Amino acid sequence: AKSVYERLKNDRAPYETRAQNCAQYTIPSLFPKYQTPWQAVGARGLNNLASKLMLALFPMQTWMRAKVDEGLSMVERIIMNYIESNSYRVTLFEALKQLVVAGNVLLYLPEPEGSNYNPMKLYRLSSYVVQRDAFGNVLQMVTRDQIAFGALPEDIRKAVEGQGGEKKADETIDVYTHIYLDEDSGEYLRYEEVEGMEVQGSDGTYPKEACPYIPIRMVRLDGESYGRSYIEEYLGDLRSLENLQEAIVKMSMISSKVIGLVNPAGITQPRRLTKAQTGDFVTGRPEDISFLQLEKQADFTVAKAVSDAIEARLSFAFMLNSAVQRTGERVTAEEIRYVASELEDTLGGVYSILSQELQLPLVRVLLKQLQATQQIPELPKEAVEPTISTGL
Amino acid sequence: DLRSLENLQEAIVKMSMISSKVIGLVNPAGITQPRRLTKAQTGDFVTGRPEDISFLQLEKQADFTVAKAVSDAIEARLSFAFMLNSAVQRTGERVTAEEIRYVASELEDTLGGVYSILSQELQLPLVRVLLKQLQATQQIPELPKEAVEPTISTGL
Amino acid sequence: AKSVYERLKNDRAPYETRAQNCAQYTIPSLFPKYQTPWQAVGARGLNNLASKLMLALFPMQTWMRAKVDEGLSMVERIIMNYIESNSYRVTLFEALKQLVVAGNVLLYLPEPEGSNYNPMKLYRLSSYVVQRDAFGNVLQMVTRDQIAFGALPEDIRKAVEGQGGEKKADETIDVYTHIYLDEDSGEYLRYEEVEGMEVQGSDGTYPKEACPYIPIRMVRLDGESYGRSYIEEYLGDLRSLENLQEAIVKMSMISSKVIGLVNPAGITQPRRLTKAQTGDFVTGRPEDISFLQLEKQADFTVAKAVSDAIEARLSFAFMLNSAVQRTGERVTAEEIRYVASELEDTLGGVYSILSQELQLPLVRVLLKQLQATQQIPELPKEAVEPTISTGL
């Protein structure tokens, strides 16, 4: 399915350069095309956004939910035990950090295969494409990866590399992965594709609810698959801050220095002026030696005032500069509603959309995938596939 | 009023960026060269008359202040125009109990009858089409016969 | 395995010069390529970061965790007894200090061999390389060391130096150490390599969980093995502070001095001016003697204002300038959650990532390695290899 990616590459390339061009002025290297941001109020605002939203969506407390509901309690308390011991909060911080930059981070959550260390493989927008319908559901997802020499298992790599050729011992070849909705059936089919062909013995199917690959957006906009971010609407105000304060500091460094101008047709030499203990009296007219004195004290103040205006408005733009209850008591008890309502009132419906596009499908794929090799006995028959209540 | 704010602050920032830079003008008929001026550790003494090198100094500090004052006026009036800048009870307690009437009355007193019109053009027909459409394949048994199609009371 | 290091040297050299170039403006000599930093707000911010994070990750209190759980209590209270009497907090301060400069500090924790003094040998990024996969696990680690003459034990050194040659009595030869994941097996194999060959009788194996060599990062970034730091995104703002305040002080020292200029074609001599008790009247016109008076009082103020701006923003950047509860009462009781939440809200997910990449593998390798020569009887059979619950 290399041709599908190369065809609808044009369907993602407007979203690509927006994401990359809006990444540059707020974090160095979450998107390539060192080299530091010149001044970085956006870099702190972004991390504060992530640090608030991590406590907002799901804290350490119970977030996911007469004689029968004890079996409801165990199946929804075992998932929080599985969610920490596999280190989910390590990579979901990266996910949400990508979410408030680009717009569409994927979250691969592969099969357990025991009780080992299974990491949430993340993907960024320079690797995958999604097609959506008029109503707003997924149709097909085409992820790409580069693979090194020995990082792939050698189970398959004999036949796909037996076509001919002596290659370098770190040859980076691209591999693809496609999931698509069937024509007649409502199940999704998944497979990998290497070297421009199907793989030996890897094709699989998945039920209706729980896709193995969860796409996400942060602001919903119909008509197309992906979505925007609100740093895409503070982009120009941040761009003006960077292109202002670079000029501010590079003006300050020129103003600080002292290039003393001495007259050439005078009597004084600078060679005697260079050697000077304090107190001695060296010859020379007091007219010749002067200094640069470029004389912009008030002209700096307009730049510092406009910078203060941008600095103060970006402060309320990115949830920063807020006296809060970070002075907690050993746990976070009622904190998530305060921070959640404040980020709702400052950012848009991000606490609303991430409760039905992040809190929902992670719980669905982790109540499907974890129960494949079933590690907890479900006692009742009435609510074997119960509701999924997120957020509250 | 918003259009004037955009077409003002674009000029404000693009004035600030020109004022921040330093295009030092050196005289051409002088003795000083800029090539020696470019290389300068702090403290060394390089030749040259102190008349030739000057800077732009476009000199509008007070003329910026009228633009910043008119921007402050628009910024302060748009603040009350769009319900922003209001100390509220967003410091809630785990739920919203009595909050909806306070916010509703404040947006009524600031925006017009939007809380009135959206209680009879949004809260009403969504409830009507969701008490018709959901009961087509009926998922809850209606017990009484007296109020099978009852009233629709919205807002309050 | 000298050739493996010399091959993927290119895989680390972008991370090398970033770490070394970002070390220079914040601490003198945690990385070579005396010579003091010119002005050093970063040097204090870095040590305050370490001093907060040391109480954050693990204090003196119990951090690691009906009739059966007493045996859980002893095995997790003996490890805190072993963690102080071998002086771990001495070298882990160096480790975390390397962590918020470079990005990848290794923590060797060799075998006990009794109950002697066994030090956590630290490694820095100029000595070792790690390869990672697409999911994010380790594959191979190649550490380097230089060794002096008699510092190595002489158990082996006869055969490796019997190749021929009369060498200097402090000849620094490099030695290497490789650990790698097997092709078929899931155990790691470890060995040393001296002089470009295998060593006599030293090759060993290790179980699945507890690697003897624990790599670490501070901000997670997929696609490559190592990682960045947030001083890599305050680098330019700190660099401007150093290159500003060097000019500030070297302007102040020139402005303080007094090189009095006397006219040469006048009547006054400076030789009579040099000798002067207060009160006497010495001859001379009051036109000839003047002073330099370079006259930049307002031009200094723009440099001091821009320095104040950088100084105030770096203050909140490095957790400094925070009124806290360092006025404690004999112990730290509830303190670790306050400091932990504040550094979470200021630095990123460092308290999250170091609870699953520092607090986890140290506990795993110290519940594997300490129980080799087993010093505490495990009573129950149900939780002999129990869970590892970190952070909380």
Residue numbers in the entry:
A (entry chain E), C (entry chain F): 13 to 45, 54 to 85, 104 to 430
B (entry chain D): 275 to 430
Quote the study on this structure.
They are also critical components of the DNA-packaging complex and are involved in tail assembly. Here we report a number of crystal and high-resolution cryo-electron microscopy (cryo-EM) structures of the T7 bacteriophage portal (gp8). The structures show two conformations—open and closed—of the portal and suggest a possible mechanism of the channel valve that regulates DNA passage.
A second cryo-EM data set yielded a higher resolution map than the initial one used for phasing. The overall structure is similar to that already described (RMSD 1.03 Å), with the exception of the conformation of the channel α10 helix, which is kinked in the middle and deviates “upwards,” instead of pointing perpendicular toward the channel axis. The kink occurs at a region containing two adjacent glycine residues (G386 and G387), which provide the necessary flexibility to change the orientation of the N-terminal half of the helix. In gp8open, the kinked part of helix α10 occupies the “upper” cavity of the channel or α10 housing cavity, thus defining a larger conical channel instead of the two inverted conical cavities observed in gp8closed. Therefore, two clearly different conformations in the T7 connector were defined: one closed (gp8closed) and the other open (gp8open). Although the first structure described in this work (gp8closed) would impede the DNA passage through it, the second structure (gp8open) would allow it.
